[PDB]
Amino acid sequence: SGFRKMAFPSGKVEGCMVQVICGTTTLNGLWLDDVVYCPRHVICTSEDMLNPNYEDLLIRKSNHNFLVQAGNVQLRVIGHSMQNCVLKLKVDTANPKTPKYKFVRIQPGQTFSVLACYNGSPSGVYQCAMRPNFTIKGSFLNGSCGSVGFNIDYDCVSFCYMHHMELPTGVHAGTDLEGNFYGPFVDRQTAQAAGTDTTITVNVLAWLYAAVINGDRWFLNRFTTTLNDFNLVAMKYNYEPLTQDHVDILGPLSAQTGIAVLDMCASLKELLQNGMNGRTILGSALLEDEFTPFDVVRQC
Amino acid sequence: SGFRKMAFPSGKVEGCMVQVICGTTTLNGLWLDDVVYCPRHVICTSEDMLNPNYEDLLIRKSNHNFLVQAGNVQLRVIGHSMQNCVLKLKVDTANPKTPKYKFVRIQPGQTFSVLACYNGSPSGVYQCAMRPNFTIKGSFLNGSCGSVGFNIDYDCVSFCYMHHMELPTGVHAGTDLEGNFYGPFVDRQTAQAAGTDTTITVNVLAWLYAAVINGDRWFLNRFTTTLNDFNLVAMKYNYEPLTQDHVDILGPLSAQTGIAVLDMCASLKELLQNGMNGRTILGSALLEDEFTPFDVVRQC
Numbered sequence: 212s213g214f215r216k217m218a219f220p221s222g223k224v225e226g227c228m229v230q231v232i233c234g235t236t237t238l239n240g241l242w243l244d245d246v247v248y249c250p251r252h253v254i255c256t257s258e259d260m261l262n263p264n265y266e267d268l269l270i271r272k273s274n275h276n277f278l279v280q281a282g283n284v285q286l287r288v289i290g291h292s293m294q295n296c297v298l299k300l301k302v303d304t305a306n307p308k309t310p311k312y313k314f315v316r317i318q319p320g321q322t323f324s325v326l327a328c329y330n331g332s333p334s335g336v337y338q339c340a341m342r343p344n345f346t347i348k349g350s351f352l353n354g355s356c357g358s359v360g361f362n363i364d365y366d367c368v369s370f371c372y373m374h375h376m377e378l379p380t381g382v383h384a385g386t387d388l389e390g391n392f393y394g395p396f397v398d399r400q401t402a403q404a405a406g407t408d409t410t411i412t413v414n415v416l417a418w419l420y421a422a423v424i425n426g427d428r429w430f431l432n433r434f435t436t437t438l439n440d441f442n443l444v445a446m447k448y449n450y451e452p453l454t455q456d457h458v459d460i461l462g463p464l465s466a467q468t469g470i471a472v473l474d475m476c477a478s479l480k481e482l483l484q485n486g487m488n489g490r491t492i493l494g495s496a497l498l499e500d501e502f503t504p505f506d507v508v509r510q511c
Numbered sequence: 512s513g514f515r516k517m518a519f520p521s522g523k524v525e526g527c528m529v530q531v532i533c534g535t536t537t538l539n540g541l542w543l544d545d546v547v548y549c550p551r552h553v554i555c556t557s558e559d560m561l562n563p564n565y566e567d568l569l570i571r572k573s574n575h576n577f578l579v580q581a582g583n584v585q586l587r588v589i590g591h592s593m594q595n596c597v598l599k600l601k602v603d604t605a606n607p608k609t610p611k612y613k614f615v616r617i618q619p620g621q622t623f624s625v626l627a628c629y630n631g632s633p634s635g636v637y638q639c640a641m642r643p644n645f646t647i648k649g650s651f652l653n654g655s656c657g658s659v660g661f662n663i664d665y666d667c668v669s670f671c672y673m674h675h676m677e678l679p680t681g682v683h684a685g686t687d688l689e690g691n692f693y694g695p696f697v698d699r700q701t702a703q704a705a706g707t708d709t710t711i712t713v714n715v716l717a718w719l720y721a722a723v724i725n726g727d728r729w730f731l732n733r734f735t736t737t738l739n740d741f742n743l744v745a746m747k748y749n750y751e752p753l754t755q756d757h758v759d760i761l762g763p764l765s766a767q768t769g770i771a772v773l774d775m776c777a778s779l780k781e782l783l784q785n786g787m788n789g790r791t792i793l794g795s796a797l798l799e800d801e802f803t804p805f806d807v808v809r810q811c
């Protein structure tokens with residue numbers, strides 16, 4: 212037993228991380244087969260990064276302006292192109308460590324693991340959720356751009372996130388691996404800011420089921436509620452509405468614990484209206500919303 | 512910016528994990544050079560595991576009773592021996608993926624990353640602290656024994672923990688890699704239970720410094736306190752006493768933020784006496800004690 216925020220083992224991704232330098236900008240790239248993917252802002256200078264025209268900036272570059280280092284081996288760049296907000300650097304060597312992979316775009320409310328990297332060297336691994344407002348609450352410093360987020364199913368790495376920037380509130384923004392931003396954000400200097408966020412209700416419910424599986428039962432009750440009455444409470448507390456599909460997704464956890472989904476909703480209603488009264492659930496004094504139902508089943 | 516519970520990248524350890532079967536018991540082993548290390552209870556049966564005599568149990572075994580699988584390759588066991596609570600299985604092939612490594616024993620209050628594994632296959636990675644009572648609050652199911660904890664410095668893996676058991680409160684116990692238990696626990700069936708735990712004060716202080724570095728300042732004050740007066744409060748709230756060595760270790764974080772250690776102690780005294788009044792620090796409504804000063808410096 213026990214329940215922890217757990218990342219996927221990172222080895223398969225560590226073998227794909229490289230360093231990309233253009234001018235005085237250093238960041239990370241992802242080396243899959245004979246292509247290195249990286250944020251296109253690697254080509255910008257301080258002056259450009261106000262309102263850059265990336266198509267102009269890139270036509271002024273040559274293959275030799277991109278220095279790619281895979282550990283202690285220089286990779287020779289033989290072609291370059293832009294795809295949305297990522298650059299694709301063709302190199303003369305296919306990565307022999309390329310795993311089976313896919314490029315997937317995730318939905319708000321879904322989780323993934325982040326391999327934070329600096330100078331092409333992995334530094335740490337942690338779990339993130341894509342917030343309803345399309346930001347992530349990560350841990351990223353200068354040099355971390357090009358770090359990736361991913362899930363692993365069987366032997367296949369599904370890459371979902373590449374890191375590009377930090378917003379004024381300290382949260383993080385980036386793109387899918389096709390270079391399309393999550394959320395209404397752009398890789399240039401504006402006053403852009405995260406929009407209002409909400410709590411991921413289906414995930415809070417999943418985490419309450421994880422708590423019951425692990426022996427925390429104090430918040431349970433015999434009462435029940437209707438889906439409509441629960442969603443009235445959710446709206447008041449800035450929680451996302453619960454759909455019948457969410458109820459269906461929680462079915463397996465409800466069956467395992469014998470607690471009907473709408474009974475757990477009544478427990479959550481009481482927690483929202485009364486707080487915890489100095490108690491904790493799975494080591495937290497707040498309701499946690501960054502575990503999906505799948506994350507709970509995977510671990511419990 | 513941002514601050515997350517972050518594990519070390521696990522690749523170097525993933526390449527060392529194997530499956531060990533003896534009889535009907537399956538668990539994990541650690542394959543370094545031509546030795547596989549695993550919990551000695553792999554040789555027990557249901558009846559034995561009450562009060563086993565491991566020396567007797569092991570003399571009745573042969574090399575061929577140990578089946579070792581490295582991915583989809585069977586390793587041939589050519590010798591076996593017991594070292595404290597671990598078995599050392601000599602195999603006919605040195606692991607070509609053996610990293611530079613050390614076997615270190617950690618202290619209570621120190622952190623490490625855990626690579627949870629089942630059937631010799633890594634499942635997830637997370638950070639743990641060794642509690643003052645020599646347990647860890649992990650996430651381990653049947654089959655997870657032999658999973659290891661480790662830190663990485665430069666290119667060298669310092670293995671510190673091998674998993675053996677779960678105590679009645681749901682916390683976890685295990686040994687160093689020389690097979691010596693952390694804490695007063697034994698690999699047999701008794702009514703053994705975790706002793707009383709305390710909060711790791713130096714780590715709470717480090718995490719408060721991480722909060723300031725990341726823009727949370729509401730708990731700061733102009734007041735200060737004496738070390739003796741603070742330790743009177745620590746005792747009342749079941750916090751470990753703060754030593755001058757802890758103050759020295761916090762020096763760099765104090766210098767970076769300009770907040771003297773004893774000023775931060777005054778803030779902590781107020782948080783202990785008054786709580787948070789509905790506010791949060793780094794996304795928590797509780798005081799977090801599983802980040803060391805080094806963990807904070809590493810990330811911030």
Ligand SMILES: *[C@H](O)[C@H](C[C@@H]1CCNC1=O)NC(=O)[C@H](CC(C)C)NC(=O)OCc1ccccc1
Nearest residue numbers: 252351352353354355356375376377398399512
């Ligand atoms: C790429 O390494 C970098 C990652 C940032 C740096 C601080 N925290 C991160 O996540 N990205 C940028 O510096 C980015 C470049 C634009 C052309 C998209 N701009 C950015 O994040 O600006 C905000 C900022 C910069 C430095 C510190 C704090 C916020």
Ligand SMILES: *[C@H](O)[C@H](C[C@@H]1CCNC1=O)NC(=O)[C@H](CC(C)C)NC(=O)OCc1ccccc1
Nearest residue numbers: 212552651652653654655656675676677698699
């Ligand atoms: C080895 O895989 C296993 C790990 C346990 C199983 C449940 N959670 C864990 O961390 N260790 C044992 O089963 C261990 C064997 C003794 C001979 C040391 N005994 C143990 O942990 O017993 C308590 C327990 C067993 C099963 C479920 C819950 C608690």
